[PDB]
């Protein structure tokens, strides 16, 4: 069924599973027209499909042309997501296909179930966790590839960089969700923390800086301070 705090270690067992987040599929700017009405302009989007055990991220870039001439775009976006996830699964060898797909928003359940009718043994599940995957577009290199795309495109990343060489999946996921929660709560401050020290760089083939174990502990503490700080600024505490 649904995924929550009681069955959290399931994410790091040896059953292949993917998180799917559709928040950033249909993205718009709202603006005034010359007549003083309001209109939207779509911008490029992405599906965030993540294996939490391996860090493998399948980033399907959603180019604005896919919305041309379409109606009810927020509803279409869920079905377009489901179509693209189904196409990804079919593209994978059988032994790489997930046994479960966890959607971050319950409105993806029916679209994905319908698109996956050919895969009755793949479990489609919601989650009670409030995961911060909408902040994926605050990772500069992911935002860059999405905005530069002139056509539909799939790009593959490891969102853990090389962390699994030193830490377990569970810890790597906890670090990722802390970073993304911070970027979501106060992006400027979070990026400042991540880049304040120019001696620590981001490798060309990585998304995050090359922190030592000690530096990651310091980074992680600063991110919790930021999150607590914002929580205080927000609620006056």
């Amino acid at each position: 069924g649904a995924m929550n705090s009681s069955n959290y270690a399931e994410l790091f067992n040896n059953d292949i599973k993917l998180f799917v987040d559709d928040t950033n599929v249909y993205r718009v700017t709202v603006h005034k027209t010359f007549e003083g009405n309001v209109a939207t302009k779509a911008i490029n989007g992405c599906i965030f499909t993540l294996n939490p055990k391996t860090g493998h991220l399948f980033l399907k870039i959603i180019h604005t042309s896919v919305w041309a001439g379409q109606k009810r775009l927020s509803q279409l976006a869920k079905w377009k997501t489901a179509e693209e996830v189904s196409a990804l699964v079919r593209s994978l060898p059988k032994e790489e296909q997930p046994k479960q797909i966890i959607v971050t928003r319950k409105a993806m359940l029916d679209p994905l179930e319908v698109h996956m009718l050919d895969f009755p043994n793949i479990a489609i599940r919601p989650t009670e966790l409030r995961l911060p995957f909408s902040a994926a577009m605050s990772i500069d290199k992911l935002s860059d590839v999405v905005m530069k795309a002139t056509e539909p495109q799939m790009v593959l990343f490891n969102i853990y960089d090389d962390w699994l060489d030193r830490i377990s999946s569970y810890t790597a996921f906890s670090r990722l969700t802390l970073l993304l929660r911070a970027l979501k709560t106060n992006e400027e401050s979070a990026k400042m923390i991540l880049l304040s020290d120019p001696t620590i760089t981001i490798k060309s083939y990585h998304l995050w800086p090359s922190f030592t174990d000690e530096q990651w502990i310091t980074i992680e503490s600063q991110m919790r301070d930021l999150i607590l700080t914002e929580y205080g600024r927000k609620y006056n505490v």
């Binding site: 279409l76 079905w79 489901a82 179509e83 029916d110 679209p111 179930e113 319908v114 698109h115 009718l117 050919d118």
Partner: peptide, 16 residues
């Protein structure tokens, strides 16, 4: 309603 009988391949959104 969520069965292959009810849903044509490639008409998933339309048919649902």
């Amino acid at each position: 309603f969520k069965s292959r009988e009810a849903i044509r391949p490639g008409h998933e959104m339309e048919d649902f």
